[PDB]
Amino acid sequence: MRVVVIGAGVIGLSTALCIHERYHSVLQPLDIKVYADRFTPLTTTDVAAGLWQPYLSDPNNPQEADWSQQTFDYLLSHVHSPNAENLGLFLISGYNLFHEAIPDPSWKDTVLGFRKLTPRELDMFPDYGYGWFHTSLILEGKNYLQWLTERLTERGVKFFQRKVESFEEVAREGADVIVNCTGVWAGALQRDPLLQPGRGQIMKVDAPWMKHFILTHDIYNSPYIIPGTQTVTLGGIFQLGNWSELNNIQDHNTIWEGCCRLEPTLKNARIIGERTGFRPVRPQIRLEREQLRTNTEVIHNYGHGGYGLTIHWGCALEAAKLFGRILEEK
Template sequence: MTRNERVVVVGAGVSGLTTAVLLAEAGAAVEVIADRLPGPTSLAAGAMWGPYLVEPKDKVDQWSRDSLAEFETLASDPATGVRMTSGIEASRHAEAAPDWATALPGFHPCDAAELPEGFASGYRFTVPLIDMPVYLDYLQRRLQAAGGGVEQRTLRSLSEPGPASAIINCAGLGSRALVPDPNVRPIRGQHVVVTNPGLTEFFSEDTGASPDLLCIYPHGDTVILGGTALDGDTSLDGDTEAAAGILTRCIAVEPRLANSRVLEHRIGARPTRDRVRVEAAPLPDGTLLIHNYGHGGAGVTLSWGCARDVRRLWTRK
């Protein structure tokens, strides 16, 4: 690896932008190529740090810890859109807390009086909550400050960007066609953005494998309400019935939301794979190709850890 080598990052979601930032700050001449800027799925995220149905567990645990440490640092700067926020994750069953939650600041099991009606167990902790439009804008500014560039266009193959010392594939769902990788599938997610009636703490329900999620993420003047997880659905069109269900579920937990005004709907398709793919592979012409995709609903949670692994693979070439 030498400084000023041209490196192309394909994709401008949270994984692509984070990876581009780390490589540009390491001295590469980074160019991000994406058909949408920023990526719509990342823009639609809630987003709270926390591993969400992703494998392999050993690597996911490390990637998550690396990202958590970075978000804790970023939370000291309001311009990043990252805040350390206290709140509750609860279950309607007597579920044990996941191991990743028990290590978070302020973790403790909830008393029955702290839980909404109908919930059997829960735990409180403090965790990074990320305002995605603000955060993605921060990443783009940081990339620009490091000398990185962005080109908005659609690629038909991973060899199309032209001469480069390395190509980093962070195309998410686009990897299904670009790699090609038939193991990547979409899981549609929808959030409703409403005015904030004064909430400062998050609430989320452990809904297991249900397609109907429940999360309440306050971001200053707005609150992100969720959500859905529809396996195999690629549509980015608004679903009024799903939105009504989200509002009903969230208002039942937090009645103050009944008077909130709906501001917008955010829809994305989580790029899901049985195992997150972060590995190097050569293109037919010998160009180094590094994959970084398949993060499902944990793209934000894994972003800094996976990007650091990409940087290590790039520096060892």
């Protein structure tokens, strides 16, 4: 059974791991290859800070909440193990800030110690009058990919640099199953106008005294500050439809000004890095089987917008179940 995973970002690699894990014993052989034209550190996943928090707008979709829940419990079970530094996985607490009161989120019990902010905490943020405090976790995108890559390498998964032009190209080389985890660029392989880039820009600064995340909300251009292992991510940029890869100077100014107003100690933080990425925005994730005419199936797993880390593991297990249902059939 020759499987080809197209995509080496969090979705591609986690899906690959779940397939190997569930079906390596069952197939003789399970042969798994990953193709991609961008590998860490050049993927969209590498840009992500990796804070576990779904978006504010609840889609009222319990399958998706359950994928998110699953990912969180999965991560939590790793967080106090020897592995965890290697995943780039740790616990972090912090603030969500609003101008107006709004209802409690549906994930309020998934995270730890969720509560409303007190008056004296709100006094620390003069521009905001309502908010949340909780403890969640960060899974730093670059590190996780590195960790996933090692696990895949130990298991005999091979990696190839390739820009795939079509599914047929891969099918004609003998792939029995193609796993399509091509993120925001999925449209090049099969027309899909619901998939758009949600362009983002961030900067990484040296500010190791910042121990909390801070997220603000006005639709998604509002500053956030999210400490990682080594650096602090500053951002708050979201431009639907914009395909520019360049760091933009207005946006730079917008992140820096906005974040400094929020946390003036940042004024003296040294800027280490700056990056631009494209969130794979789709009103919902594409995750399904689709047969081609060649015998060759595709499993789509793409379109996770601004929450790919938050939800990836549930999606990976689902994709593996689809893979399993292909085995039952064929």
